[PDB]
Design a protein around this ligand. Structure first.
Ligand code: HEC
Ligand code: HEC
Ligand code: HEC
Ligand code: HEC
Ligand SMILES: [Ca+2]
Ligand SMILES: [Ca+2]
Lengths: 323, 323
């Protein structure tokens, strides 16, 4: 039976946030991470926060082809969702960061994203009187707790709470056959039988390893821009050219556009391109429609996040830098 | 007694949101307005929402000298707080919009702010399947409820909930003498005795009328940029040159920088400039410090807003425009 086959390849998202080794999630550290995720003072301009590009109301992404950051500069890649990102084997589309705490240091410093630097960020947080007390509560064994590393750890334990349990497919995996429609179940059988679960398996429906984008056919220079060689830039290993981490397909129906280039807006087109590029098949329009109906059952409960009330500047807070 | 004098000039913010005539606040219409306030699809770029420039975590402002909108374009004016704006006599620093619903049509259309147009906004909301149902619930007697006017009305009844009761000064006005410090009470006596309450009175501590910025002395061409003649641009009446609405001073300690130009970062400097420019006095540093201690008692309870979960695009949703 397709339910039993699925139960051998995928797992539901747990209700409880996962534990980060060597980063305990106290109430104070998670609260601090939620404040920092929404605080645009993490950026040089004081205008961009993590929620700008990973909007918790829009599936943890920004619904753009590629992100726009400091100075209205467009980046090379589509912003992947923060939802469930804690269950991926590594972070970024090329897997270059080992975990969420390592990842968070990237956007802060990237000139086309937040355009900040660690020293300015620490000075800024130290100048906001309400922040050092919260760092002391969250990192109480440190003489100097307001550090870049601690910013990254706080944001990690907050992001570990941004999981989306209870999608209809997870209720199916727990044994409720009626939680998805017959057409969704036929999409699930097509997903399994065409081979998609090789690269999109486990608790996260993906995020499990590194694969060429174009195992069987080049997706072409729009969907796969030639200069973006993926993990090759990370490892300098020729076998990594055009290799990317598979994405988690959880919440894919609400995180358009698709692929690391953001050039494919319709989920049905992304499914057909995956069949061609990865599997050398031409998926029919009727089969692609059933697979999309199945992928729509992977949208989980969206987190319900209170927007933080952030502590005010002092007169010594650094002034925004917008150039 | 200074408490009795204050009770004759100011009033505390009511706990209940005020009623908007001809815009009833049903649960559905207020919920819709909260979704729209946080939805960056109100902008051409799909990246800017009202919360970008009126951040509910940062006192309802953006803590910049002047706002930056579409294309990284800097505007001429500092963003005033949305908190308590429902109690001002008119909206914008020049009072050119009669109420919050009229005001909301401005940022949507301004090329240096959201850079949208009404027809594109309506088409975009109609293309997001979850939005027309919510407009029907909020505006049930209309055959075509997804309109620009209705967007503005929904956002108005949401903004009428963004009031900040329970500041320490309001507890003092209700008869608790100990709710503010002796030094704050001395600041209050100085505020009254120097004449500041003529222009900063009532329920909102301001927002009550139109006054020259520079009754007694020109603040100079940095703090009062010469090309920004305030209400003169609205009325073409020469007596309105450099006339601006007085701001509400509620939450002023957390809404820096100050004045419509955003050029004065320190509240103590703004107090001294008000004494010179408006009253022809040189406030001493000790008196300015007591007045700032009093203004700090005007920070009320900050609203606790759940970030909305916004309905996803369809494949017919217009794609972002970033140029
Ligand atoms: C827009 C200008 C961004 C801002 C601000 C932040 N992020 Fe981001 N994020 C962005 C892009 C374009 C990408 C992909 C880049 C690449 O080279 O692959 C990312 C990636 C992430 C991830 C990885 C998720 C995954 O691999 O599945 C995470 C967890 C993430 N971003 C988190 C994050 C945080 C915490 C931020 C504030 C400190 C932040 N991002 C800002 C775009 C932008
Ligand atoms: C491994 C060899 C894969 C197989 C087989 C399939 N997919 Fe895949 N998928 C894979 C990668 C490495 C990526 C990212 C490629 C990139 O550079 O962007 C993807 C991406 C998708 C997406 C887009 C998701 C998103 O952008 O967030 C979808 C919708 C998707 N894959 C679906 C899918 C289906 C339905 C498949 C069977 C027909 C399939 N994939 C096979 C790796 C692999
Ligand atoms: C930044 C790019 C802005 C965006 C996006 C929005 N607003 Fe704004 N707002 C901005 C400025 C610079 C100003 C002052 C302009 C002037 O000419 O005076 C405003 C003003 C307001 C007000 C008036 C408050 C008062 O007079 O006390 C309100 C109520 C307001 N803005 C609300 C608002 C809403 C609801 C928005 C989304 C539709 C919105 N603003 C976007 C800067 C920017
Ligand atoms: C009317 C004649 C006024 C008197 C007397 C005082 N103020 Fe005022 N104030 C007034 C206006 C019209 C404005 C806005 C001017 C502009 O173009 O920007 C202000 C502004 C302030 C501010 C800044 C608040 C903010 O930017 O949100 C403060 C802190 C302020 N006023 C304080 C203040 C004090 C302490 C006064 C007595 C010494 C005083 N004001 C008098 C109009 C008038
Ligand atoms: Ca995407
Ligand atoms: Ca201000």
């Amino acid at each position: 039976d397709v339910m039993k086959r699925a139960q051998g390849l995928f797992k539901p998202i747990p209700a409880k946030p996962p534990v980060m080794k060597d980063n305990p999630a106290s109430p104070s550290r998670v609260e601090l991470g939620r404040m920092l995720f929404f605080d645009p003072r993490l950026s040089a301009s004081h205008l961009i926060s993590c929620n700008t590009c990973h909007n918790v109301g829009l599936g943890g992404t920004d619904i753009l082809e590629t992100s726009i950051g400091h100075g209205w500069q467009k980046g090379p890649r589509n912003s992947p969702t923060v939802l469930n990102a804690v269950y991926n084997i590594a972070q970024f589309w090329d897997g270059r960061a080992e975990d969420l705490a390592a990842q968070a240091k990237g956007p802060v410093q990237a000139s086309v994203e937040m355009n900040n630097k660690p020293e300015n960020l620490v000075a800024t947080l130290k100048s906001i009187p309400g922040y050092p007390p919260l760092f002391r509560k969250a990192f109480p064994g440190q003489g100097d707790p307001v550090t870049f590393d601690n910013v990254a750890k706080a944001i990690e334990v907050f992001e570990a709470t941004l999981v989306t349990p209870d999608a209809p497919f997870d209720k199916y995996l727990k044994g409720n056959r009626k939680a998805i429609s017959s057409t969704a179940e036929q999409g699930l059988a097509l997903f399994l039988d065409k081979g998609c679960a090789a690269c999109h398996s486990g608790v996260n429906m993906g995020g499990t390893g590194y694969f060429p984008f174009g195992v069987r056919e080049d997706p072409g220079p729009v969907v796969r821009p030639v200069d973006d060689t993926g993990r090759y830039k990370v490892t300098s290993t020729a076998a990594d050219k055009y290799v990317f981490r598979s994405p988690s397909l959880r919440n894919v129906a609400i995180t358009m556009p698709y692929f690391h280039s953001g050039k494919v807006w319709k989920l049905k087109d992304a499914v057909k391109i995956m069949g061609s590029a990865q599997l050398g098949i031409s998926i029919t329009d009727a089969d692609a429609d059933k697979i999309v109906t199945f992928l729509n059952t992977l949208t989980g409960a969206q987190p319900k996040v209170m927007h933080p009330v952030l502590p005010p500047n002092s007169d010594d807070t650094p002034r925004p830098v917008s150039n």
